Amino acid sequence: SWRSEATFQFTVERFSRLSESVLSPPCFVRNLPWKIMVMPRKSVGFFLQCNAESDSTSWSCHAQAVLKIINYRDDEKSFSRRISHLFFHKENDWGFSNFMAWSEVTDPEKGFIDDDKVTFEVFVQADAPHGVAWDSKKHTGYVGLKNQTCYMNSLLQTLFFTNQLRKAVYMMPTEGDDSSKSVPLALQRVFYELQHSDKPVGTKKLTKSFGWETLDSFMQHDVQELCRVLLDNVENKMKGTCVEGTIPKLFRGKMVSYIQCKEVDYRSDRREDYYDIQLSIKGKKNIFESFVDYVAVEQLDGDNKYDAGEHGLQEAEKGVKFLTLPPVLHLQLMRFMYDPQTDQNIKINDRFEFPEQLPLDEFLQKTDPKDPANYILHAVLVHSGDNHGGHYVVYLNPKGDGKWCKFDDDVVSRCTKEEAIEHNYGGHCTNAYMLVYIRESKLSEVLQAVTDHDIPQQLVERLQEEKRIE
């Protein structure tokens, strides 16, 4: 019943003498009544109805479709069109008002009719729908998150599925604490339930630990910061525990920003750590072109001339260079910027392409054979709306096997590659802003095996008490 797609027919007898709208007998997909509609307007109507008879206002299903009119003389001569649409009561029906010229669907000389009967065919491609109890933990084995903290959910999951971090986090000494203050703890919950629950997991108490309340302290930052609040937070806690320095060992990299005055002999090198990488896009085509630009060399002149002390203002070069690329690579694409002419905080939906395999040791001044620097796509945080608000999802293939899933809040579905990748490449309206890549040699480690027997014990217990009390 809850199939992911299908095809169904509906034939209208006594057509020419038609006066009103005819609803077909329901076909089910994703557990929803998808019906066909035919009504004149002279032209021939053709739409697809979707669970229009349900009262509810809290439900939604997206879907592709092929409204097809069969040719009783040859199938390849049939006339059909394509439609994509978001369905929900207020707009439970989509299609075409001028689906075909009535004078052509009635010309007995070209098939479409026989006994003045016309046969309509509709191939629907349904996604998982919200507001209709979707047992994520069933046809995905993965559970979801509620609400939408905006981008926090995506980040949360993206993190949960960074296994090595997960175990390490579990193993924290979170006893002497206060269940509403302790972030590490407040995260140990999410992670735990995120694993054992069958019902949406409640961000609720985590959202408090940072202070990020009321939700404008969510729009007042971005993934990067949250990632850095949660993360950095968890380590000053892993600071004396057998799982010490786990985070940097997973996400940290050593960068180098330099300067070497052109005419005079003076250089200034500064290695800095880094837990992510902000890549530019506006004007670039793919990731490989972003790195190229990132490691381009900026000249200092005019007002930009370099402050050189005993040398005074001088002419120099300035640029950055990588020394090491983390095991886990957080790449944030800058699509969110401040327009010049407006006062607007605008989003750039231009087209940017990321690949499944990333070649990257050719951007370090010194590479190490035996241990290349090649990452593989692991997560794609998407966002929709040319507006700075909207909706946050996140695609992943948790065990890095190439098998994907969409974590749209409490609706985790199985999906194709071209849906997480080739589908989030901008658009000249819905796309990706962040990415997670894991190095090819450290995959198996970063994505270790999870067992109910990794979580402390006394922890499963504390998490238990609090869940008996009131």
Author numbering: 64 to 104, 113 to 219, 222 to 501, 510 to 551
What does the paper say about this structure?
Herpesvirus-associated ubiquitin-specific protease (HAUSP, also known as USP7), a deubiquitylating enzyme of the ubiquitin-specific processing protease family, specifically deubiquitylates both p53 and MDM2, hence playing an important yet enigmatic role in the p53–MDM2 pathway. Here we demonstrate that both p53 and MDM2 specifically recognize the N-terminal tumor necrosis factor–receptor associated factor (TRAF)–like domain of HAUSP in a mutually exclusive manner. The crystal structures of the HAUSP TRAF-like domain in complex with p53 and MDM2 peptides, determined at 2.3-Å and 1.7-Å resolutions, respectively, reveal that the MDM2 peptide recognizes the same surface groove in HAUSP as that recognized by p53 but mediates more extensive interactions. Structure-based sequence alignment of the three HAUSP-binding peptides revealed a conserved four-residue binding motif with the consensus sequence of (Ø/E)-G-(Ø/G)-S, where Ø denotes a non-polar residue.
To investigate this process, we sought to determine the crystal structure of a larger HAUSP fragment (residues 53–560), which contains both the substrate-binding TRAF-like domain and the catalytic core domain. We succeeded in the generation of crystals for this HAUSP fragment and solved its structure at 3.2 Å-resolution. The structure contains two well-ordered domains, the TRAF-like domain as a β-sandwich and the isopeptidase domain as a tripartite architecture. Interestingly, there is very limited interaction between these two domains, and the intervening linker sequences (residues 199–206) have high-temperature factors in the crystals, suggesting that the substrate-binding domain is coupled to the catalytic domain through a relatively flexible linker sequence. In addition, the ubiquitin-binding pocket of the catalytic core domain and the substrate-binding groove of the TRAF-like domain are located on the same side of the molecule. On the basis of the structure and previous information about ubiquitin binding, we modeled how HAUSP may recognize an ubiquitylated MDM2 molecule. A conjugated ubiquitin moiety is bound by the Fingers domain of HAUSP, with the C-terminus of ubiquitin docked in the active-site cleft between the Palm and the Thumb. The close proximity of the C-terminus of HAUSP-bound ubiquitin and the MDM2 peptide suggests that HAUSP likely prefers to cleave the ubiquitin chain at the proximal end of the ubiquitylated MDM2. Second, the linker sequence between the TRAF-like domain and the catalytic domain is flexible, which allows some lateral movement between these two domains and hence enhanced access to multiple ubiquitylation sites within the same substrate.
